[PDB]
Amino acid sequence: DSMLARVVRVLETFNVDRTAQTASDIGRRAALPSSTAHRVVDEMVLVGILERGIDGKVRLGMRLWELALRGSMALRLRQVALPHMERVQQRVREHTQLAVLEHNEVLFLERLSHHEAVSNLALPVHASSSGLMLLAHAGPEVREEVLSKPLPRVGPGTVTDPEALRRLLANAYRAGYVAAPGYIEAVATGIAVPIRSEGVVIAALSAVQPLQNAVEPTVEILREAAVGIETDLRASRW
Amino acid sequence: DSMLARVVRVLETFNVDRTAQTASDIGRRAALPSSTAHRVVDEMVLVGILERGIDGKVRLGMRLWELALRGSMALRLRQVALPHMERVQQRVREHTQLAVLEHNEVLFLERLSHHEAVSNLARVAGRLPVHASSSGLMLLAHAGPEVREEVLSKPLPRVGPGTVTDPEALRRLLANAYRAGYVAAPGYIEAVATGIAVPIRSEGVVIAALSAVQPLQNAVEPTVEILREAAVGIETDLRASRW
């Protein structure tokens, strides 16, 4: 294998219950020849991805942690959200999504799709339930800043009258959800709720399901999941 | 300019403010030739260390995060503890350590030593058993009665001059440590040094021990107070929102 693939295999011999190892134990646990193992370990120690600890064994290095922390804002949210999204999938059996607002555009970070989903997945801020929910919680400037500019009816059901949007956004803000019938397919609706962290809306959790399906049960499931994401983000320490 | 050194330089072009870049921009910022950059970035995408979006751009990937989470308790503790450990060093001017308990073994995560330290640390590679350090005793004191009695059914070698070995003495010592919030270990690592440890909590659970090593005759209680203040600082910072 490439150097990098071997490095990853070495890293995957470590776990929360196995902090410190010898290079030989690494070799066995990664199924790497002893001499390859020692060489790969030594290169990893040189660049600080591993460190040689107080006990003579190697352990994961501070530099790996520091490097990973450079993406913590998106990566930690994604990693914490995913178990809650799985739970949503088990109950709804359609599609669940996680989204954030980045440079006044909606960036979808994760989507799950159930093999039995009836609805189908397919973008500007006004053209998804997620974007609408996020827009509803953005600053007053960002609302105006986006409403003045172009609002194409991107799908069949896409609301794009500046004044229809103000009422839609204001209701979403009060109610803690927004629905978006026919925004992607006329036969499908999108439902989004906010995810809070430290008092601010940082993301939106959404479902796509058939238009005819009841909306309120999905709002409840998404809320519960959004509450769980917040709890785990807030309570987690590492 | 090894493969791994190159991978690291690519990762370091990212930061809290730069979350998405093209392979070209990465080549410039990491001083890589653009052919090398495209190849390196592509290999990192292939193992999941980077993720390439639909619109061409590359971001730090879930697999990097998940690999770091294989040691995230130890690593984050070290990071948060270090500034508090440095302040202990300025005031006490001996040694300050951080340790955790893994499968009833004591792992030391950091050991700082002041250039003017009178006491001496063991500088040989190895691992003391759980009963043979102040950190081990503090950690054992919070491990619960089941773990205690397991340890006390097993061999208790008298490793150093001061090492307490009598099962009943150890039960009293551990109970006292639990109530008092510190343990002292006079003469365990050398005859002329004492170890002093306090607990570090997260969410009510004792997850580590902060310790000093200092000369045998130095007063224990002034050092305990310093360690306690540092432990409070560590506990407080561990619950800061932004990592």
Add this chain to the structure above:
Amino acid sequence: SGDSMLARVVRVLETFNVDRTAQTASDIGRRAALPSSTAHRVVDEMVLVGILERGIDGKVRLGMRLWELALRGSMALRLRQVALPHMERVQQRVREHTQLAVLEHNEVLFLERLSHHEAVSNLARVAGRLPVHASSSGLMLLAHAGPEVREEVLSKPLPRVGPGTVTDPEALRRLLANAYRAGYVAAPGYIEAVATGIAVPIRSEGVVIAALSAVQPLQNAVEPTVEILREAAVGIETDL
């Protein structure tokens, strides 16, 4: 008054202590200063309902039912017992008001309130119970409840109970988030416009189980009271 069944039952229980675990029915007459005939009646009824226990050897002891009855309110009772000396220390230093409170069914129950004679600020003179968003204590407790519980509370109207009471749900989310990270909250003007309230959490086994709070003049420095309350809170935690 001294002559009811209950008053006599209590006087009997008080003859027992850590050293006097086992007595006789007549020796209880002696130490409680009751006539033996009336003593043997009260004991027998106490033994019947299980407040005392007696073996074949005549010996009477405090019974398991007494213990189980007391346990029905143990957290609150034990917390008060432990907290009181630390609160008196706060009273000496701040010379205003110190309170201890718990959350039950998302309502704040004040368990203890000490007011110093020279206190410049005034406590609330509302007879019934303030809601959870209407005191520093309720804010501190709510900050440690689930986001679930937070969003339940914030889904209902929040009256402006005092001059300064924050009722805006977004301002509340920000206030609560900050309180959670900082380990205290302030509630300026919640009782009177010239006073504030400050609370810190009390933990047991990792869970915030109560709030220790002050009321003091609005103009006074906040941070010194926060530290005093913090020292008291740590003392209370040690002792539990």
Add this chain to the structure above:
Amino acid sequence: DSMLARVVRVLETFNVDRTAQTASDIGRRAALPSSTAHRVVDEMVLVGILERGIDGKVRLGMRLWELALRGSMALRLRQVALPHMERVQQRVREHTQLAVLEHNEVLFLERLSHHEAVSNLARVAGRLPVHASSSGLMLLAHAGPEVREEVLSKPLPRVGPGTVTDPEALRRLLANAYRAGYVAAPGYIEAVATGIAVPIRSEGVVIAALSAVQPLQNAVEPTVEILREAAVGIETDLRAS
């Protein structure tokens, strides 16, 4: 119903999730007429068994807590120990006991006997001599050297066919028990069943003995382990409050 039974019924309307009640609520839950609930509650308040809460309602009083605590040494241990003793009963199906030292004699705080128990357990008339039970010998092993020597200063009676009386044999017995963490022999009184005892600790000190009685033919070692696990469980529960 008597005054004291009503008082008790009032106390039983409280619980860990209901600490403050109106007297009318108390009447509802205790099945008392409104007039009766009021006067029962009022007198309970008057003597401090209840307290009238800071915001109007009634709650369990500090006085009740202080009264309960006068026997917490026995009562808390018993309350905490009982579920672990029931788990021993389920696995061994004989007899489990809980004992402490009172005035240098063995006081049994709890005894459980299983219906299907093969062995027979002697009916106990008060406290037993400290040297005449496995529980006694286990507690004595962890008492002071002062306590040990006081017991051994006076010649000891042969209370049963199993009783050891010789001071030197007792010293060896006690040293072995202290070191091994159990006493196991024929019953030191009847000696037709095996009495087994292990220490229960709290905060570094042996506070009680957990014991079994079982037939002479049964293996000792598995019952020692089961009792040890229970003793560790009891200690654990005492430390988590």
